[PDB]
Design a protein around this ligand. Sequence first.
Ligand SMILES: [K+]
Ligand SMILES: [K+]
Ligand SMILES: [K+]
Ligand SMILES: [K+]
Ligand SMILES: [K+]
Ligand SMILES: [K+]
Ligand SMILES: [Mg+2]
Ligand SMILES: [Mg+2]
Ligand SMILES: [Mg+2]
Ligand SMILES: [Mg+2]
Ligand SMILES: [Mg+2]
Ligand SMILES: [Mg+2]
Ligand SMILES: [Mg+2]
Ligand SMILES: [Mg+2]
Ligand SMILES: [Mg+2]
Ligand SMILES: [Mg+2]
Ligand SMILES: [Mg+2]
Ligand SMILES: [Mg+2]
Ligand SMILES: [Mg+2]
Ligand SMILES: [Mg+2]
Ligand SMILES: [Mg+2]
Ligand SMILES: [Mg+2]
Ligand SMILES: [Mg+2]
Lengths: 300, 101, 59, 35, 237, 92, 257, 196
Amino acid sequence: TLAELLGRSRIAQVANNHKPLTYTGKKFHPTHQIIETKPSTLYRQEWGLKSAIPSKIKSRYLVYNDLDTLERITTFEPRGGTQWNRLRFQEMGVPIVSNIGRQNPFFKYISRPEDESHAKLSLFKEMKGDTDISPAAMKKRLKKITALIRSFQDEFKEWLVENHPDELKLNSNKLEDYVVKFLNKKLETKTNKKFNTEIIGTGGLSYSLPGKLKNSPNGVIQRTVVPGRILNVVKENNDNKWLAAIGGFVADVVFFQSPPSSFNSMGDFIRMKTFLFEILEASMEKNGSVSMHARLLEPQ
Amino acid sequence: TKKIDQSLSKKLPKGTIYDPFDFSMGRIHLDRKYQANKNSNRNDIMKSGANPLEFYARPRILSRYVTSTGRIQHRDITGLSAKNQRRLSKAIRRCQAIGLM
Amino acid sequence: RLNRIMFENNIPGDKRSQRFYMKPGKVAELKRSQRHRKEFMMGFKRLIEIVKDAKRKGY
Amino acid sequence: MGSLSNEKFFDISLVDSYLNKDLKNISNKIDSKLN
Amino acid sequence: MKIQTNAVNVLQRTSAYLKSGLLKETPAWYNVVASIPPSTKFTREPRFKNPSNGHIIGKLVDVTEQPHANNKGLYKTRPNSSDKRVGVKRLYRPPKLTYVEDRLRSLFYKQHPWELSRPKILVENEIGDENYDWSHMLQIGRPLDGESVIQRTMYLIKTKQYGDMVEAYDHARYEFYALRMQEETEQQVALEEAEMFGSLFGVSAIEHGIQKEQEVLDVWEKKVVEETELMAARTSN
Amino acid sequence: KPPVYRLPPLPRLKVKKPIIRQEANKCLVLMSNLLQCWSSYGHMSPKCAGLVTELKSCTSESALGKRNNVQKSNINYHAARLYDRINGKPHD
Amino acid sequence: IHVVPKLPNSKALLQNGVPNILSSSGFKTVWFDYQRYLCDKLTLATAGQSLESYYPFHILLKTAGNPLQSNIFNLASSIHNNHLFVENILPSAVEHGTNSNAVVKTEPSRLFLSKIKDSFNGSDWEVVKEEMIYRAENEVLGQGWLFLVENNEKKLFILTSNNNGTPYYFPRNQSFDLNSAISIDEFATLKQMKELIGKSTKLNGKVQDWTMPIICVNLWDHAYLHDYGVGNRSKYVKNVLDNLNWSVVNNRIFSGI
Amino acid sequence: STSLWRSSTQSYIYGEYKGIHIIDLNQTLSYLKRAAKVVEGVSESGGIILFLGTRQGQKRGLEEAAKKTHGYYVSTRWIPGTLTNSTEISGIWEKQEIDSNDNPTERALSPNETSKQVKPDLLVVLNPTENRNALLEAIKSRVPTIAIIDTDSEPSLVTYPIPGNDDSLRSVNFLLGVLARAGQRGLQNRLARNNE
RNA sequence: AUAAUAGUAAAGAUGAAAUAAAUAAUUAUAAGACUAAUAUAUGUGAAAAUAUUAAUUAAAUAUUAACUGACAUUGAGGGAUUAAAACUAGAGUAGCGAAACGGAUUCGAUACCCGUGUAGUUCUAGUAGUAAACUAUGAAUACAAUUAUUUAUAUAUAUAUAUAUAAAUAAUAAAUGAAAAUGAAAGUAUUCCACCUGAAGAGUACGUUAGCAAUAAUGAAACUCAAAACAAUAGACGG
Ligand SMILES: [K+]
Ligand SMILES: [K+]
Ligand SMILES: [K+]
Ligand SMILES: [K+]
Ligand SMILES: [K+]
Ligand SMILES: [K+]
Ligand SMILES: [Mg+2]
Ligand SMILES: [Mg+2]
Ligand SMILES: [Mg+2]
Ligand SMILES: [Mg+2]
Ligand SMILES: [Mg+2]
Ligand SMILES: [Mg+2]
Ligand SMILES: [Mg+2]
Ligand SMILES: [Mg+2]
Ligand SMILES: [Mg+2]
Ligand SMILES: [Mg+2]
Ligand SMILES: [Mg+2]
Ligand SMILES: [Mg+2]
Ligand SMILES: [Mg+2]
Ligand SMILES: [Mg+2]
Ligand SMILES: [Mg+2]
Ligand SMILES: [Mg+2]
Ligand SMILES: [Mg+2]
């Protein structure tokens, strides 16, 4: 049918997005899907959208929100520049590593309840992870849940007197433990936030596995040298490290001992010059940012 | 001169991604144009769900929605819903009558 | 800086408006018209921004 | 927990089980089990 | 705008010209239009089913069909106010098409933000030629991307290999990671192998960015200097 | 949530006096600096020598220099061209 | 989707291979299997991208200057090179399937033998073939390609490539193996090439090269191992150069009529 | 966009998706086939077919469609009055006499024959929302018309509507090509019956 | 307004003027009236009206459950409420301010501007029932094509949006209309009430009823005339 075809159409494949096309806050990762048109189609203003893109657009990459609007225009920005940030990261050949030494999210590991010993930490995270929830929809998590949990009273009024009667007659320090486990055991079958929207690992920035060496005609490369730019002429206030602009990413540059004298000389125009840096490590934070650490390799 | 006004230079945060356009003057102007106090909601008690009328005895919180002379700010400036603006104004007027604001 | 406070609290305007008495009906008419002009200007600026955005994208 | 709760501020479950011979018919049941 | 009458009746108005004799010669279109009548009803048509999800439109559940108690513990014994409002408008409003895959697509790109940075071509080639066997993720003719994961997830739930959508989705995600890792290595190794055989490249991606940033930073230098001199004069006032 | 205000149908969309960025005259800024230089270091002070030399060259032929920055705004051309498309008016 | 081109007299090729060079099994590996292997990988690499609508020769030129697209370049170069090799070693380019033609006597043309003498200091074609066999054995340790190429100066010269090295674009000829040791003369050639690539003003850092292949010999294991075996690649190159289809090779030399 | 919906097109809508209305292609195909047969009939009958489209990029499709149907096209601007005021606009331009094979007879035309209105037998409009003038003139002149009708376009203004996207050059050129080939087949069948 | 304090010689007003130990400043005391921002009269109220605070009493919303079982709509007569001004008593009286008396302006100025400023404006208890008391649009019911924007209720979740159903407002299709325009009515229909029948005379005269009174309600005819009126069009003119 036509409905089946539409669901699989290339336009349906693009997930709905209404995030501001002009965002002036902090950008940590791509927010819009880049659309590309071939040179032949660009010559005919064809992008596979509803309407022809104006001929003024010469780029072959754009990002859009709405196919059509009440203003009879498409809401789009003729830019595709987050792809070059990803490809420049690939050229730096620095694998992303976990600063906490967690399991690789891209491998199906056999995990155990080592961290599940915090059942009361995360079972209540469902009601306590409400930082940005409505004052009454979050309050609907109190009566709606209470009825659901109150429907298991009979089950827990028998299991507890059949598996741990001593605690019911001595102390509730262990009873509270049996309660947290009970609900989780009766909730694992349930589906509360069964889909987790948190970023998985690198989020797709890099699929490179650590360990491989870079062979070169001049021998194996031991230190990666990448051109960059120093943004500030004074270390980040309250931090012992300056900031550099390397390959579309802002890194923290650590200097060997002293800061090169071109800093004082150039002043606030220091960004006008290119320096060579060494990328020590790259980490991924939960916000979805990349923590790139560099070192200002100076001619010596 | 080795110095530039802060208004003529953009400081790229740490951990963020950038494009060559971020070093241009257009970025400076674009950041000024689209500079709105959108982070207020998370710091705005009255945009969180509390009833502004419960703060009639807390002049410090209420003093955040009046000018230097005590004039209640128009809803266009506070950004509150009609109900919260209505309740907030009542709270301030009651606070003034009690002798606290 | 002091002048900015006066203008942000409408001190000069209020003083002038208190020199002569205006009938309540006239006061209401003036308040209605002023609000309309304020709202009209906001709608005008919204349409100009769309024009500029449309021009930038080649429409 | 309901009737078999440890909270100082309990609910009507406890008062209902008392007047319904439940908190007593379970105390004896538990004690009988201990025997 | 009013339903026009004169555009669809050209044949009948022309026929009056010919019968009276005002028009001597029959127009060339006259016979063609007579054999192929225009559609002239221009009516609004009811619809009783959403083609996307098969939801039935125009069905009222009677109280006799709700014998059991509700979530509140109360029985339904009389129609409610909503049941007593005519719903003819729903028959004529274009149905909102919805798809389960849309929910998964949003999830995938929320979990993998950088997948958005991989350019997607919306221009179709020929939808009718797609002969895909979704037992495997890779397919000849289409790229490996988020859609590969979604279609794989649907095939798993359609074949009933997995029951929960989450489990099928997770299974597809790992297959996607494996294919993404094999490609990241083929490209790295291909570059390394070429340089070892004497391949030369003019400008690298990192170099391209530096040059573009220099062009912008040069214009920015001029303006800063100019605007740091007008301020000095204007402030001197 | 930010209140959108929609205008009624209008006979025109026009800016009464379009704002234009008028770059400052280079000779006038030079004169404003030289005049200030004389105010601090004194009139004819050797510190303002360069200012005097620059001012003379700027004004040598034309007292306001080669003014070639005249500009007119195109907002009214585009506003009238696009208004019917973007005003969101209902169909006829 | 990139599909394997249909070859003339394909039924004969699938039964008796290529007489005097490859057997039926040997030709199935080099063309019917390897060409399918390459085209499928190229489709997977390029599907969903603008490169899908371009022929392999155009793809290699477009991607020659992009370091991170080398995988696509390698696949495109191999596909184009393989059909250049399979085309000049083919019994007959015309499809004599219904004409049952068994008399194809193709010999070097007068323009080809005139350019050989001019560019090789009077050496005969037979001597040049010996130089080609020698160059392949001493310059291509592993996989690669042997080409007889013509440059913008009308001079025929011999080029050897390592793995998938294009003859059209000198920065990607891959004629020097840097895994082993290189002489100062080879380093000078590489240094001079790097300077030429740096003189280009284009933002893509691309140069103009008008070299064009005339003869292509596949030096990959997919072409000779099964029929000749490890170490017998010089006997394979000798047979290929002695049984070339000169209707194709002569047509590759520009005449100007 | 659903915000720009002209509810008179309700019967052509398949549904709404991503803030736009989806046109029912099952109806588009039936309307397209009906419209195509009309073009073929007029072409096979020797009528004048004019292709009107004034959106940027449409000229190439319009010129080829006219060439393969031996028709006419206008890509720049429809002069208001071209049909109702034809003598003041089109009288000066040259006419010619042709045989059943569409070959110029070369007969000189009397000044009487060179001033008479030459009215199109069929008008095809790619963008009817911007060509109200042409559509109204066709109605006044009793000229059957074909047009692509988008969700915001009035269907009743044309004899044979084709529901479909009128904003994409691919969609327009796809529909125009089908109509142009239909005309070509009619032209070839008329030239064939003359030979035999 | 008064008193004190130091400190002075002008102050106040206006288009410009002139009439009637100060002005200004810092304190203290007294009085009456009014209610800045918020603010949109949004909302609420039958209308008139209603925006400094609190309290008491009364009334007012949506959905759900149960119940009554047409108990409804409209409404002559009737009844109640009803801005401002006005009036009858008793308080109050700062500011404002008909009138009056003065100062100016002016050819004149029974005005516009200025001064002194009485009634009135305020409160309590009443009388009276009139306004461009207007949306110049009586009330009720059924129904008809869209968009946008808020509000409310409900639903869902991969939790903050999304999906629904109503209300309000804005712009419209159709329809209607003399058109201007109306737009869920000034549309399609139904039910009930009020009212109109050329202008002027006239909402006048007379009578009657009511009121302390001013007045309010009711409400003609003769004579005369072929006029009179509305929307819109193009002009001309505009201190
Ligand atoms: K109101
Ligand atoms: K009954
Ligand atoms: K009654
Ligand atoms: K009555
Ligand atoms: K008084
Ligand atoms: K009535
Ligand atoms: Mg359209
Ligand atoms: Mg005083
Ligand atoms: Mg107020
Ligand atoms: Mg209101
Ligand atoms: Mg009544
Ligand atoms: Mg009043
Ligand atoms: Mg009195
Ligand atoms: Mg007087
Ligand atoms: Mg006088
Ligand atoms: Mg007076
Ligand atoms: Mg009374
Ligand atoms: Mg009266
Ligand atoms: Mg009256
Ligand atoms: Mg009123
Ligand atoms: Mg009622
Ligand atoms: Mg009277
Ligand atoms: Mg009038």
